[PDB]
Chains A and B, each alone.
Chain A
């Protein structure tokens, strides 16, 4: 059974380059057809999408409102993938999640999340 684990700082000040990492246990980064999605769940409303990274082509995709501030990087060793965020300010807050998505056999290009992590509360203060 695949398990997801994330680690990072607890208290992070704004106006800097935020960096979070997620460790993958059991399943490999390569796999067959998977996306190492990075999402957040702000308190008050539903979650939001930041970006994802392909498993083999190392290609990527970002949200239409978060360009030039997110750069997802991954490495073959240590079985983990990281996330880089710029200009945190007072918007990028609350918990963060590093979920995995599997392709759907009913259609082409469909991707839905099935396995999640635990959640790391990213507090922003002075």
Chain B
């Protein structure tokens, strides 16, 4: 089975700083990866799909890159509305496994 893992579990930063989230896959899946932003409560919203194409309506402070099995997403600016949980989901056929889940903290 295509297992998905995420590391680290959580980090700690301040407002306006750069946040880097890394997702490691079991095998090479080219660029068939998407990112999702899950705020506390309600339903989440898609952030970046295909690991390089942005979404219509998302700010330009989010950028993603990576290929094969190692992927890393960076954030240019951390705003008050960006405090949420990030999830990386692969879609290389069934099943559509999700990531481990990350969280941000404010000191």
Contact = CB atoms under 8 A, between A and B. Distances in A.
Direct A–B contact present (CB less than 8 angstroms): yes
Interface in B87-107: 87, 89, 91, 93-101
Interface residues of B, number: 26
Contacts of A37: 96
A46 B43 CA distance: 13
Nearest to A106: B50
Nearest to A114: B46
Q: Name the interface size band of chain A.
A: 20 to 34
B98 A47 contact: yes
A46 B91 contact: no
Nearest to A66: B95
A107 B98 contact: no
A45 B100 CA distance: 7
B94 A46 contact: no
B34 interface: yes
B98 A46 contact: yes
B55 to A, nearest CB: 8
Interface in A104-126: 104, 106-107, 109-114, 116-119
A48 B87 CA distance: 12
A116 B87 contact: no
B65 to A, nearest CB: 14
A49 B89 CA distance: 11
B1 interface: yes
Contacts of B50: 104, 106-107, 110, 112
Interface in A69-126: 97, 99, 104, 106-107, 109-114, 116-119
A110 B91 contact: yes
Contacts of A118: 42-43
Interface of A: 37, 39, 45-49, 61-64, 97, 99, 104, 106-107, 109-114, 116-119
14 contacts: A47-B98, A48-B98, A63-B95, A64-B95, A106-B31, A107-B32, A111-B96, A112-B46, A112-B50, A112-B89, A112-B91, A114-B49, A114-B55, A118-B43
Interface of B: 1, 31-32, 34, 36, 42-46, 49-50, 53, 55, 87, 89, 91, 93-101
